[PDB]
Amino acid sequence: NADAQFYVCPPPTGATVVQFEQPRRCPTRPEGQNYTEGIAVVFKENIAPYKFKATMYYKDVTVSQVWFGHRYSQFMGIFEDRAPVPFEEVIDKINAKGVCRSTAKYVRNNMETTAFHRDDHETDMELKPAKVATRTSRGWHTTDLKYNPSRVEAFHRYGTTVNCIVEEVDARSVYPYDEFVLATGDFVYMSPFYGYREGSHTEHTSYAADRFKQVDGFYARDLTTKARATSPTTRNLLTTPKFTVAWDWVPKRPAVCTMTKWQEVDEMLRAEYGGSFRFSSDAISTTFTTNLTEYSLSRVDLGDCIGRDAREAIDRMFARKYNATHIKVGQPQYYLATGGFLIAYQPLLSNTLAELSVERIKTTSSIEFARLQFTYNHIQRHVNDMLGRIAVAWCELQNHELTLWNEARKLNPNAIASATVGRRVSARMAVSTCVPVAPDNVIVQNSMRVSSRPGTCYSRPLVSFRYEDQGPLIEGQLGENNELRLTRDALEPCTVGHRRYFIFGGGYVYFEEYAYSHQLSRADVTTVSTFIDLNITMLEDHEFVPLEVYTRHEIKDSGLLDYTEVQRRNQLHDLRFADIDTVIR
């Protein structure tokens, strides 16, 4: 056994004194974030159109040209036109009696043109309901057969059909609400909110003033039930060159909003640090980030829905959970969050604690940054709280153990100083140190008996050793941890049953009845551990693959009919099926 050295240091007497470090100032725990309990309503940018109901009144005018051959008949042309019903026929025939006259009279291609149904005299025809289709709105018409002229052989003849159609349609408008489109596909180049009264004349129109009338005190008569309505309304009636549309006039402000309510958060926590507010919601797992200054709702164009929906939702959420435990402090506050979110926040305070330029906000489509800000902060605050508690406990343990190190210096100053300097040293209020030389190739005697005085016998093994090989064998005595002392001064009385292990160079030497028996390895004695185990493993690497529930090619294929692809096929028809180059003379 030679993996361990041996050591000789003299008596420590010198100016090299050393002291232990005194207790350190342990760190203070971080105080913690102060929150404000509160109620929030979160708003996004409105992307939905403004939707309203309208009624179309038009006449399908059809004039056909038939040539009558000997055996057959051939259409030579079919002319289809859409004629608007006049204002006076909507009010005094259709809304009044449920009838429409059999003559269309209208201006077309800068000419007043008239058309009689079946080329017959004018009569009033009853509007009857249309044939039912699924997922269609209601409709009414006057005739269901086309009129074609009767046969006179080898002549061209003409026949006119007039069908008065009334249709209910859905109408859609998008900001700045200068136009709207109907369910037919027909644009109307007038604001839905246009009118002659109540200041509405500032709204857009691109039609002449004789095309627009308003009827106050309008009572709608249902065309199926034949029932007149009980409450009046103001109707806008606009005659276009193809149809006349009718709709209710409403004021623009309580109908339209630039924002729309997205989330109602009953428990919204507000924290202030770093010159910002952090609005955390534990239910939807988001944190929003805003500046300290509130946002003025006078900066939002068409933003009257925001204060209405906020005050209504806050009062429900206060009257559902916070009824007996909290009070509202102040009025609702408005904040613009990063990503384009408007937050209406109502601060609360518990009953225990109560001792004393116009513009458009653009929202992002991905809330994932706010949900990553939540999950990061929730893990960060927990790992900083736990590792800070370990750091205050590690400092307190290392200060508490210093008392055990002061009582152990006086017992064994050799081993305590050699454990706190970093090198084996000798030591003997301060402590004075000395560095040993390191010898090896030591021989041990076989007798622990003092021959001079037979009634005594040495406690520790006798050794003989050499500093280097050119030096004499120095007589000494084996000490603690392979320290070979220079004096033979460890005496003790001789007893019975004497049995000893002593550490001798990487293994134990065994003496029985003051006589050398045999040397051992350390792998012979049973090892007990002073140590407390702690098996910390590392967190392994993980790879995040791209993952989507629908690719962008899937969301575009979800539509039934693609306008770019149908027009690309249809306009290639003469390049596939005709010849556009040849001219016959």
Added chain:
Amino acid sequence: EVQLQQSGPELVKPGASVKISCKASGYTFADYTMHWVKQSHGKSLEWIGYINPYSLFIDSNQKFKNKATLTVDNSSYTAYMELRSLTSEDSAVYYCARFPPYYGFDSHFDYWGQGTALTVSS
């Protein structure tokens, strides 16, 4: 031609009620609105309100809510204005006027009555 014959009781007691009429002739009485205005001693013209003889819809000045009520006689082609609780400031010339039953650019008082002159005194 179009004429609005307007006659009513002209001398009345304070704290009473009077009914002015405006007989219409020369046009269909049911497809125009009948309006009423007030001209006190040449100071201004104040609009009272109107009535549609067909749908019986009424839109009125809120200044005259506790003062005037409007009605029609469809069989007689006459409109009526009833002025209750007559004080002396009600003494004025009251006119009747024709107007279209819609709001266009053309819509204006195109025919008038001659005016009944009311006097609240003793």
Added chain:
Amino acid sequence: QIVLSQSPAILSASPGEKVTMTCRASSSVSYIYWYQQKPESSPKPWIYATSNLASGVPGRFSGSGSGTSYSLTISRVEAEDAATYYCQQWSYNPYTFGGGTKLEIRR
């Protein structure tokens, strides 16, 4: 109630002179409407839809304006053109009339 201040309160004119009378509104109105009242007689329609001339009025009258500012002009003033002229609006409830502008002829 919307107000129609109608300046001047009284204007004097010599026969042949071009004169003008204004009507300015408190809020914006869609159209303006003019009426003529001679004493012991009803008002008669004079100018409708800010520019159009009523049935039987002379071509020497013209109107102009939009929004909150309106005007009535005579190219050469005759002696029968001597009455009060009222501007009125119906864009708001109630319909209101202006204060009137009295036209006096010089001799």
